[PDB]
A paper describes a structure:
In this work, we use such AP-based cotranslational force-measurement experiments, simulations, and structural studies to investigate how the ribosome affects the folding of titin I27, a small all-β Ig domain with a complex Greek-key fold; the stability, kinetics, and folding pathway of I27 have been extensively characterized in previous studies of the isolated domain. Using a combination of MD simulation, force-profile measurements, and cryo-EM, we have investigated the cotranslational folding pathway of the 89-residue titin I27 domain. Here, our equilibrium AP assay and structural studies reveal that an all-β protein, titin I27, is able to fold within the mouth of the ribosome exit tunnel, despite its folding being dominated by long-range interactions. Molecular simulations, accounting for the effect of the entropic restoring force on protein stability, reproduce the yield of protein from experiments remarkably well. These simulations reveal that I27 folds on the ribosome by the same pathway as when the protein folds away from the confines of the ribosome.
Residue numbers in the entry:
A (entry chain 7): 9 to 24
B (entry chain 2): 1 to 46
C (entry chain C): 1 to 271
Write the structure that this text describes.
RNA sequence: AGGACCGAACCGACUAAUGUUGAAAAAUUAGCGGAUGACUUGUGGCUGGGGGUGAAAGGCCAAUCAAACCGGGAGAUAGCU
RNA sequence: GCUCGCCGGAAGACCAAGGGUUCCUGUCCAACGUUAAUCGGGGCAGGGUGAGUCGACCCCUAAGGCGAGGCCGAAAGGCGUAGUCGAUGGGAAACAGGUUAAUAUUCCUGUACUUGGUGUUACUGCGAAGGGGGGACGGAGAAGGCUAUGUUGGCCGGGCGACGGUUGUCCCGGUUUAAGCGUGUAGGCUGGUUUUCCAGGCAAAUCCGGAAAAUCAAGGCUGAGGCGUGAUGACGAGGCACUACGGUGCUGAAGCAACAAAUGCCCUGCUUCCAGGAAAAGCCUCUAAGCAUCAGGUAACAUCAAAUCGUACCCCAAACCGACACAGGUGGUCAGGUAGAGAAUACCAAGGCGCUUGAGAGAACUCGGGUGAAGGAACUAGGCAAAAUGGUGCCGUAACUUCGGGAGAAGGCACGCUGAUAUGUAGGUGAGGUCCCUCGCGGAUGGAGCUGAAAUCAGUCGAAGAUACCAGCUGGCUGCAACUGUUUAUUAAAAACACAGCACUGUGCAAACACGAAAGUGGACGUAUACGGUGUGACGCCUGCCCGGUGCCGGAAGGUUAAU
RNA sequence: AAUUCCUUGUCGGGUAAGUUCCGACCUGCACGAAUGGCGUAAUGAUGGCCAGGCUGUCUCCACCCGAGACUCAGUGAAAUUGAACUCGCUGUGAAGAUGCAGUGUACCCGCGGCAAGACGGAAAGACCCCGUGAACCUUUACUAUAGCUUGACACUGAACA
RNA sequence: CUUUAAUGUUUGAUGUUCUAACGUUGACCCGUAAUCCGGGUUGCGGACAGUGUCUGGUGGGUAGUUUGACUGGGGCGGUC
RNA sequence: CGGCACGUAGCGCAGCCUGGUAGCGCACCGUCAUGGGGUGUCGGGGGUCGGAGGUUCAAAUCCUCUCGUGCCGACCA
């Protein structure tokens, strides 16, 4: 499946 | 934690068993396909 | 006797019970019971088809004679009972031929009084009679609509009907709704107002009181997203729609009566 | 008497640290809420996919949900990589 | 094997669900076991599940399912009557002990019981897919009576102490016993019996129901437990043997009383309250058609039948759901001692375990804990986290308040141990002896024996007596939401949702409304004091102006206007 | 003010000092009466502010007891990876260099430590635009349509006015 | 071989009356120990109601879609 | 700042669109009442049209240069 950090929004969204 | 499969044979047979399968035009087509496929367990019963 | 409760806890603070001391404490007349079994507001398709219905206490069904055929024979009212299936109270009856039945319970009730049905029968609270034979102006409760059919008007606590006129083979009645409906005159109609009346005044007082009468919560239109219901989304309250039922027809004034088969009978609609 | 009080079982999941190739695809430890009620629980039943159910979050409908899963139309179409 | 340590409302014990040979015994160690492995829930082989009484099957039905005909639907199919299925509920009956390596309320010993068939012997109106009765039912609360169970004494057996003392007011251990049968108690419910009559109980009824009288009132159900019996039986501390050192045989004392005591039982009771608390059969009774010497019905004794299927083992887990011998999830049952209010908590018993890598080192750092000079929130987004508070009795307690609350507000004081009051008191329990008597498990009086708090006075030890474990921090101002509650299973528990209360609006019942090509079903076996929809959200004081727009309600005129 | 942009408005209070807080003013950018106004005892794992107690939260960290980290023995993973003989600096350069130029420095190889760089690993960037992309949602967008509703003809007749 | 008007008709509009299609989720009867259906009798309603075809209205309840390009990012503006 | 709308007698809008006149409300001022005022009957006056002139016979207008003022936007991250 996918690692938790990839699914998680705060770490992943990082630069909008 | 409580997971999705909570086994119970009564429910098993009532929901997926031979007779249940047999009680509906489509349930019968279920068997028909499995027979044509040459399946060794038509419906996992006693 | 209506009675406030002392605030020994919130959700008692506001309660107001109706205590009827003269109501039979103890079990009901066994052989006039059949199981009722709850509906959960659900169809024979399993589909919720009237919302907000579920749970509540168990409730055994009291039979109740609405038709009132035992003409001639008189009866005596043994006792007054509480009925879970209705607002009104019922009186266990006992006709002289040894037979017991369940009547409603007009304002007078009171154990030991004497009831009778039929074209003869005293004009007096509790006696049933074709309105053919009740004096115009009486206050007649549980009323038949088709002669011999059953009795379907004014059966709720404190309700009543007023016979105002009777030309031809017909009577015109004044329903509590304020409507003016004609009815076949040959129709039975028990005499007087129906009891409790005070029923109106209870206050329930807390959430549970509702739940355990089998009423489930009502969730507002505009508390839901667009897909669920024509109301709201909005990023903050918002409305901007003529109000409608969850299927789109307007509430707030749209009549929705369409019959014709039975318009002949309505003389004047309520307001 | 009580959707009454303090508090175990039982039901919850407010804070923190740990854990994050875990002991664990959602838990551990210390604290925390409810605890005769709109409580909680075993068994069995009914509701089906633009449909269900929803004390309403687009929540849940088998670790899947702004339209479940399986097979089919099927080599959908892809002026894009 | 001897120590040591850990759980003990479990980490002990019995199951259901689920698994499906994991059970027991031999044998093997490659693979499986997070290491080794002589060991295993692993390989191979053999063994092991014994029932009239437990359970299924079975009779009975709830939800709900299926459904001859039937109604409906382009086909497929949908709904539903008669029925017929469906337990999570009702329905006859066995207990104490022993034994297997492995099952046992199933095998064995002792002692029982249930229902039918048949026979004998008495005595008799029997008889339904039918009537009535019963089965049959909620929540909370209150004690009384009682058992499990415990403690002490007595009794029995054994002990005379590795170190000063222990022939005693000393130590250790045991002191267990069923169904069944008899008795019918504490206590619960209920007036009995006869005669006649009757529009009810679809027919019938002697039953139930109703109405009269008539006569005695004590009759009848229900009923924990105790007591007797069961039982000279069993079990039994402990003994002696032998053992292939795992065990296996044999023998066998006392086996009483007092006090305490459940959440169990009496109790499906009793009291009270509103939210008003399954069904059907088995059972009892009633008769109809029908049978009247018969058959059937009742009883005693005798006898025969009770098939079939399950029964090993795990079952808060290494055997089930979690891909794992996974810190998770999993319903029911039992529940000892010391302290304690307690199923909290700490230490123990019975019993069960030390968690399937270990051995050394005594660095940084990380995790989890303990203590800290002086300072005491200076930290920080924020006292995050830690620290502190923590029991019982008495004294005492502000604004405000819907008069309940706020409140455990706040804050004080006492607290151990010894002696006395009182060689053990207030109280609890209660045997003798005497009287009463419808003689009983009765009652009255009776006070041995047993049990035994709290107070005060006096004294006394520590730094400290609610000494461990366990066990509120408190107060002031203010926003929001009345309140208990609900929610994004897995980053949001909130001011969001709900709520009682309020209002508008629809709905006259073949209701509006919803599911549905339809039949039909829900709404409701309800009927406007009802039901749906919508908004608002306890309570208090209140809710002003605008109908031009959009919508809705009303409007028999006229203008424009569809098929035809 | 859960509404105030200007705004740390202004005045009063609390502090040695207060963009928050409590009380006011009214100049309400842009409150207001059941998409309720103003109050409110009680309740709240609710938001903001204050104080006593308390303390390793801090000044500023010390020591200690346990589990890892380290050593030996047994068993034995992982992501990543064009190929590697895989230094510093200044500069060049698809514009932020271990690898190019110039130059400085550096004997070969572990073990324990630490994370500044390998524009480290992980996921064909949500965010931004683009495609004559998708989906759900909205409405007085367009075209249709179930539903509701209107009339005509049929089922459907007789009288008398 | 008539407008100022009226007796026999074939024919619309309205209003009364009737029963006989049609409705009846009134009552009773039988199939039948049966709250289904059917048949029957009867009361009520009655050429209405309802339904079929056609038809005007309403119709985000539901569905399929459209909603331009240029652009010193895109949007807004402007432009074509 | 930029977008786009408008300042018009003392003051606020029409007229602009579709070139012209510049109106109207109340106020100002005078008469007339009344003792006087206020009010009012009643008479006259009051706008470089916000500044400006190119088009043209004719510009407040349309267009262009331009000033503050009001209103809409300085947003997605
Ligand atoms: N357990 C994860 C949280 C998590 C689980 N699944 C996720 C999926 C997406 C994001 C986070 C998670 C943690 O270490 O915090
Ligand atoms: Mg409501
Ligand atoms: Mg809301
Ligand atoms: Mg929402
Ligand atoms: Mg939002
Ligand atoms: Mg949202
Ligand atoms: Mg808004
Ligand atoms: Mg409570
Ligand atoms: Mg509590
Ligand atoms: Mg899921
Ligand atoms: Mg393709
Ligand atoms: Mg194709
Ligand atoms: Mg095996
Ligand atoms: Mg074994
Ligand atoms: Mg090995
Ligand atoms: Mg084995
Ligand atoms: Mg059955
Ligand atoms: Mg058929
Ligand atoms: Mg069916
Ligand atoms: Mg069962
Ligand atoms: Mg065993
Ligand atoms: Mg015999
Ligand atoms: Mg019966
Ligand atoms: Mg005892
Ligand atoms: Mg000695
Ligand atoms: Mg002893
Ligand atoms: Mg067993
Ligand atoms: Mg293991
Ligand atoms: Mg496990
Ligand atoms: Mg414990
Ligand atoms: Mg281990
Ligand atoms: Mg070690
Ligand atoms: Mg210190
Ligand atoms: Mg401070
Ligand atoms: Mg600082
Ligand atoms: Mg600070
Ligand atoms: Mg804290
Ligand atoms: Mg602490
Ligand atoms: Mg709340
Ligand atoms: Mg969450
Ligand atoms: Mg949360
Ligand atoms: Mg209403
Ligand atoms: Mg609200
Ligand atoms: Mg404020
Ligand atoms: Mg609104
Ligand atoms: Mg709450
Ligand atoms: Mg190693
Ligand atoms: Mg470099
Ligand atoms: Mg290194
Ligand atoms: Mg690191
Ligand atoms: Mg991409
Ligand atoms: Mg659409
Ligand atoms: Mg398309
Ligand atoms: Mg473009």
């Amino acid at each position: 499946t996918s690692k938790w950090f990839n699914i998680d929004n705060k770490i992943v969204d990082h630069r909008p | 934690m409580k997971r999705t499969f909570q086994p119970s044979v009564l429910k098993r047979n009532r929901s997926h068993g031979f007779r249940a399968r047999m009680a509906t035009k489509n349930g019968r087509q279920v068997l028909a396909r499995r027979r044509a496929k040459g399946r060794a367990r038509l419906t996992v019963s006693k | 006797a209506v009675v406030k409760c002392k605030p020994t806890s919130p959700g008692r603070r506001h309660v107001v019970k109706v205590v009827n001391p003269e109501l039979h404490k103890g079990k009901p007349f066994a052989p006039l019971l059949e199981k009722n079994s709850k509906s959960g507001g659900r169809n024979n398709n399993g589909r919720i088809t009237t919302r907000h219905i579920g749970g509540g206490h168990k409730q055994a069904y009291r039979i109740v004679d609405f038709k009132r055929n035992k003409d001639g024979i008189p009866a005596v009212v043994e006792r007054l009972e509480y009925d879970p299936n209705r607002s009104a109270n019922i009186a266990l009856v006992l006709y002289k031929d040894g037979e017991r039945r369940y009547i409603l319970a007009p304002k007078g009730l009171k154990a030991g009084d004497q009831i009778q049905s039929g074209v003869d029968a005293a004009i007096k609270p509790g006696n049933t009679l074709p309105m053919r034979n009740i004096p115009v102006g009486s206050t007649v409760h549980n009323v038949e609509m088709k002669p011999g059919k059953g009795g379907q008007l004014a059966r709720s606590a404190g309700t009543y009907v007023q016979i105002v006129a009777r030309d031809g083979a017909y009577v015109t009645l004044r329903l509590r709704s304020g409507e003016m409906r004609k009815v076949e005159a040959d129709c039975r109609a028990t005499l007087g107002e129906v009891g409790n009346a005070e029923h109106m005044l209870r206050v329930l007082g807390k959430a549970g009181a509702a739940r355990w009468r089998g009423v489930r919560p009502t969730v507002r239109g505009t508390a839901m997203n667009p897909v669920d219901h024509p109301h709201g989304g909005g990023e903050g309250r918002n409305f901007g729609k003529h109000p409608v039922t969850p299927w789109g027809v307007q509430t707030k004034g749209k009549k929705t009566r369409s019959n014709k088969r039975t318009d002949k009978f309505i003389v004047r609609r309520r307001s």
